[PDB]
Amino acid sequence: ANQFNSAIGKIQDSLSSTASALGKLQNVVNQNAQALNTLVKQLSSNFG
């Protein structure tokens, strides 16, 4: 029980400390935003 409680404590500390731990989710949100922005930027193009 003390090991389990201490290991759950280390999860809160880890998530409070680093930004990169959720990179697998932030990359999805970033690719959705980047793909929407690229589609808006192609309204600027002449295409000739």
């Binding site: 922005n37 808006v40 930027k41 309204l43 600027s44």
Partner: protein, 49 residues
């Protein structure tokens, strides 16, 4: 606040106009969005944005 067709200086478009806190400096007359579409204009009869 009503939707209209508009034409300022030959910039024909469609939309709703609004009094803007976007401070154009005196050399500018049109503002453009990320899409290369105008999103603000300085009226050619009352100098207001």
């Amino acid at each position: 606040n009503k939707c209209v067709n508009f034409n300022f200086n030959g910039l024909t478009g469609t939309g709703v106009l609004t009094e803007s806190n976007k401070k154009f400096l005196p050399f500018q007359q049109f503002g453009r969005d990320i899409a290369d579409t105008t999103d603000a204009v300085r009226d050619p009869q009352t100098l207001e944005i």
